[PDB]
Design a protein around this ligand. Structure first.
Ligand SMILES: OC[C@H]1O[C@@H](O)[C@H](O)[C@@H](O)[C@@H]1O
Ligand SMILES: OC[C@H]1O[C@@H](O)[C@H](O)[C@@H](O)[C@@H]1O
Ligand code: NA
Ligand code: NA
Ligand code: NA
Ligand code: NA
Lengths: 338, 335, 336, 336, 336, 336
């Protein structure tokens, strides 16, 4: 199994020009793919950014050979109508064949609240996401389609710019129910870092869903997104997590909180202990290696790593040299693409 | 020495458009106008890439200026806050290069979301409110908005260039042209006869001056359609097959389907292109047509060649047209 | 037995003139009238649009003609279905055996005035099907209630209701709705079209009727056609271009909102565009052959719209040279 | 000059009977007709409700009578204001000088069928005022647009429009709306009431007109009254109880939805309740004095509803013994 | 042993007076209270409408009486069903075994204040049925969610919830809802009516219960009646006319919006109209026989509304001459 | 003269316990009660939420305490403003001089159950200001109507209305709304905060009052504080952590929907987070000095919430060691 790893492009924290440069470097350093946040707002003012991912993805596509995906876009009609997400996905895949994966989810109020609409509870947003998947799949047939359901209405519509093979639809979720639905309805799973018991359960539910739908889950992407803090010292790594990613230490439902200023005030309660299992904080690059290998061993076929510190260039070079070449991937592991 | 290239998303695969824009840069074109469509006018045109993704590729692989021509930020395909963010991100990644072209939209694209489609005069009111939303967001502060058409809860563009991109309104309406001068940074209008073009320029100037602005330093842009080919016969045949909508001198903003335009196209004949699509192999004639528009006082011209011979068109213009155009030395460009 | 339908063009003619011409048409051997339910003309040059429902009362009281709306959209823009039902019941009650309720999916030209979401055709068909349900409930003459996707009717009864309801006729060129018409309603009205399309629509209507246990050979199959008669061919063509350029528009027109829009579109229309759509000739034998062909396909009624302003001359010419020579099947069903 | 108005009670009588009786009323000296715009009767025992707009075409074509709706609610339940405007313009165009558009705030009895929120009277007055704005825009005969609190009208024009619009008459018993009527419209219609209320409404209408620069002495002031004539007083009383118990209900009725509701309420009504509301007598001199009193108050037109089913006998009795003796002011303004 | 229900007329009496009279009624042998949930009185002359939910806390804390709403409409006008559920749960938790939640389809008199579409009775029954579903979900004492035609409830739990929920009692005179009550709820409340109607409602309730596997002989069957006791018959009749004319209105009242509307309607009411509706007599034996008859039909509880302002005198007269003589079945189910 | 307010925590305590403890607080020198209007507790561990409006009736009837909602959101989620007005009027009418209506912008914890759009705080302030207008209209005791951005009220009147309405008190920590409170309402309620914020709010309230022509020195300025008293400091801290972790959440909480959400957030809270928010000490001198400081800033009333379950011990400890030693201004305005 040949050398590789995913890089998480944190739109919440970094200017898109910096992200583009760092992705180009990550490619040179042995990373093979990019996960890009679809935000309108950062979690906190101190993070201080939120570029429009869809424009940036065109730049990335045109200046690298990396695979890339949204992690994740909510196509449930607040910022984005599902038909527009479908078109955007189809266009990226058409321009960069084999390279794009459409990552979708149920959304956060932080981003969606700007349009001033009723914000459903999570279970209802899941129902919206399932209907949005239906819309996207209809459009991905490349024919004239119509749709009318509980949440969305689509008049006669066709994607004329449509690749021969649609990009994969990946659902980002930590919910057991949706993980099973993902296996059933979509092409692969993306989930956050969590303890072994939860990760195993989500994998198991995804597999159950796939198999009951007649699909082989061993050939479907199982992707995980993790957060780490590497720096020259442990002390600096911890301080970076506290300053840059206090939301990482918030082990509670965050999808109803509307403002960066709200998270900013909540952040004041966060302490180093709260990052346990959520942000790996250490200068020891062997420990970073072991953490990632463990996740491969659980059966994840791709790992996207978000380094929370502003030392992105140093992180990328350190991983390229001391982490990525030592990871052992299974020989035939499925990657997000077609 | 310079000229604008129109990237026809209705007709051409976005990969082809990217490659042709790169070529246009080498051949002396200095800027790109990109259609924001969901559907082509006809199936025979056969494309519609998502412009916002493509603009990132263009920005990263050329030094061209570029703009949407145009996006409707009036809440069907696109909520105004998202357009503002997209614009700010393009400007931030490609400083000095992006111009946000906006308009009142066409049912062809907007009908997909299944909502009430207002009459043009009402869509103008929606566009004016959208401009207010975009400008609030472009202050780079936390803003709120509640008007007739749009609600925006506490929202801030954190990724915001020091100087916002210009807002350009695409319109052929005298009323909106005046509002454009008053509220926005420059005008984009289609090819039309001299009397209409002069009226729209005059209204734009009136609007600017009444708002305390100097219109001689604001972009006045025009988008035209031509057909160049090896023979006149081939140029005409290309216009008929590729751009019959160019021969439809009637309001098109309510027509919903490519198949509707397709059936309408069957009535279109060469005479219908008069003043709308210049069809000739004579590149001197193309030169004189463009020069006339400069002389009227347009500071930029975006040229859409309707034929599929884009590479040949670009090289023919680069050699025989662009180097001979005479622009005013200090004409304002969109940026 | 001798007969033909006259199309009253509310788009073009003052209602007083239409009333007078229908009275003349009766004298000249026409036996029925189709009346447009419009709010706007297709073009300003056409220049009229009377409220059909008031005019029909005058027609009913001053002639013995059968008459029908061709067609009313009872789908809740200009008209709520319950009001159409009442209007229909009143006409039938005042003029027993003479009225037929022609309904359809509507045009934006007329419906857009109320400023509402205009559904795509397929959805408007679903609306029409629900409207038929409302009208039929009211036609039972009892207290009814209705709640569906599109319409809500609180406790409602037509107290002024004839013993036998007027027939419901659906005007459509859609194969799907033509079948539904056979199934749910009493007869079909369709525009002039080529033989293959007309045969398909007839076949679908029959299939629908038979599957619902009805005999379609006893149900009206009506067609509405457009012609231009004048003293010369040249004048006939000129009349079509000036008066009815929309006749030369072989494309979906249901989304276009303004007379001024059609007016600008009209500038592209040429004589060739009328082929199969508006017969333009002074030769009344040719008019005869065109109409006879349609009878032969199996239409039981034909409504003729002459596009020229020469209505009185048209009517007299048809009365003398066309109507007496048409050969109808002996037992053809007519709209009640 | 000899004249009187006849009230055509759509609630009670088949439209064919009403048409025949109006033709007789013309022969017997009546000069005008007021026609109820209902969907339902007040009670099942009344038992009818023809669609007035169709019937008015028959009336127009078979008599020389003036006629008007008394009244149509153009406030977007049964009827969108733009459709009422078109209907009015068409009747006036077909029957110049003969139609008057009577409008009001509506009754739930008729409007509830469409299943919408029923505003309080004061709000329905605001809706009526906005509807007047829509109707008047359309009556300019140009392309207009409208957007207000209650109504949206996209680009719309009445192409069939008489040179002079029909008058807009507001039917109301409200002092506020009576003043608005003088200000915004062409004349007033009010029900029978005591002298103090009638004087107040007349006074308010005048105030409204004068403040708008108009001369109210040249504007119609119309009243609609209910009587019971029969061969004996006993029969006249019995007819009022059986046919028009709603006449004896001195309380707000605009929220009551069903004929069955009025039917049950009717059981409480007694002869005393008709005082000042329905004159019940066989004495035709008394009918004469009652009507003359109303002229003397300054009403320029009176529409009489006889509540009994003896319409033909009522008409002949009035024609002979009442109408020829009424003394009108010489140059009183009539609705046109 | 000895007992009877007292009706607390919020429409008529200041809540302080009602509290004092309930405390007296307890001393005089009444064992339970029915409290009207109104926002408005039927007439201005009645002149009150306290917020029942606050008053019930005072009653609960100062007596040992059972008590219930008679009735609250939990159908989302004045009150969202979740709030009714919480209010009910809190009263039962504070006063275990004492509260019964009486619910119904509501009256416009109270619900119209919020300015929403008022459905027809049949639809309001559907709303009531869905509200019962909401209340019962909340009464499980767990986190629940709900989405139906009429109501949406996001994750919600009643944390202050007694171990046993209060019974849900439906107030209705409708045969259909009476059956649904037996099926879905815990007991019935119905107004005074003739024997045939009362027997039908009891029969339907039993049928509903048994089909749902329940034993109706152990479920409350409650009736609410209206009487007028005074020193003389003349005074008793006068009190009924002045205080409770709505009692003499044998017609649907659920659409009438204003006290002033009922006030005007009241003018038609006469003593005869109270037959079977308000027993008007000074003869306390007659009161006794009337109540006993209702027990004999199988009602397990009777709530008595004396319409006169002489509440204290009524209570003492009943306590002495009526209550001790009623004979209840030995094991009759009471609302708890 | 000696006094202090007691905060009745519906989030934590069974309403029967709260009633008993308020009766004890009365005996121990407390003079008033603030009652939370919740549907849900902040955490499951708190574990309660009685319907305050029912409980207030029990309180009123069994004590002589002043009492108020702290606070009710009358902005149309759980509660329509008209119903709040009625509830308030009824309490004041039953318990004259004792009730104060505390209102605010609400929390999603309680309001989200009805499944509606939850506006940002600034918009909810606009809703609250419109609700104040509705409540004040109803408090005139006349028939009123209202139509604004957020609320519609059809003809409505509070028939049960005290001569003098209860005061309207706004609970807010916002400088803008504090000024509006001075302008539009009768007094302010605010949470414990640092001196600079409390001074700003007082200053804004005064500015608002004076600009509206009022004297703010005669209007209530109330503060609600949270403490933890126990036998040891260790126990006091432990009680705060277990019972009131939300007290240690110095961030906006108005968008958080579920008890389980707060429950998870609570896990981050530590003793330091209570600084200035919950005074945690067994030292009753320290409690005394804390409360006295607030009097010295110019608050006329203080409501104290002890977060521990040791309410009876807290009440007795305060009654003995705190309340008698507080020094109030001689003529300080109290909520009435
Ligand atoms: O238009 C902006 C830039 O675009 C380039 O491709 C042109 O060829 C340059 O001369 C110009 O500065
Ligand atoms: O078609 C119905 C009737 O219409 C009349 O005008 C015809 O002349 C008659 O022959 C026929 O009875
Ligand atoms: Na274009
Ligand atoms: Na027509
Ligand atoms: Na009438
Ligand atoms: Na609280």
């Amino acid at each position: 199994g040949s050398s590789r790893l995913g890089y998480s492009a944190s739109f919440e924290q970094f200017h898109p020009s910096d992200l583009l440069r760092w992705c180009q470097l990550a490619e040179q350093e042995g990373f093979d793919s990019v996960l890009a946040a679809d935000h309108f707002h950062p979690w906190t003012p101190e993070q201080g950014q939120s570029g429009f991912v869809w424009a940036w993805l065109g730049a990335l596509g045109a200046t690298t050979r990396l695979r890339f995906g949204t992690g994740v876009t909510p196509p449930i009609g607040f910022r984005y109508h599902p038909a527009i997400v479908a078109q955007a996905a189809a266009t990226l895949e058409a321009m960069f064949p084999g390279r794009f994966w459409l990552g979708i989810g149920a959304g956060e109020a932080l981003n969606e609240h700007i349009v001033g609409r009723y914000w459903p509870e999570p279970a209802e947003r899941i129902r919206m996401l399932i209907e949005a998947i239906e819309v996207i799949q209809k459009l991905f047939t490349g024919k004239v389609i119509r749709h009318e359901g509980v949440y969305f209405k689509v008049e006669s519509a066709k994607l004329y710019t449509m690749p021969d093979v649609p990009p994969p639809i990946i659902v980002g979720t930590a919910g057991p129910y949706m993980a099973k639905k993902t296996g059933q309805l979509c092409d692969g799973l993306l989930t956050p870092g969590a303890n072994d018991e939860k990760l195993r359960l989500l994998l198991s539910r995804f597999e159950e869903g796939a198999r009951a739908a007649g699909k082989d889950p061993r050939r479907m992407p199982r992707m995980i997104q993790v957060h780490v803090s590497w720096a020259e010292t442990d002390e600096q790594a911890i301080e970076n997590a506290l300053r840059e990613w206090p939301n990482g230490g918030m082990a509670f439902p965050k999808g109803d909180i509307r403002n960066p200023e709200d998270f900013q005030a909540m952040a004041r309660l966060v302490r180093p202990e709260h990052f346990q299992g959520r942000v790996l904080m250490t200068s020891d690059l062997d420990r970073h290696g072991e953490f990632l290998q463990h996740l491969i061993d659980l059966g994840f076929t791709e790992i996207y790593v978000h380094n929370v510190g502003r030392n992105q260039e140093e992180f990328i070079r350190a991983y390229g040299r001391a982490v990525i070449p030592h990871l052992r991937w299974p020989a035939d592991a499925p990657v997000a693409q077609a």
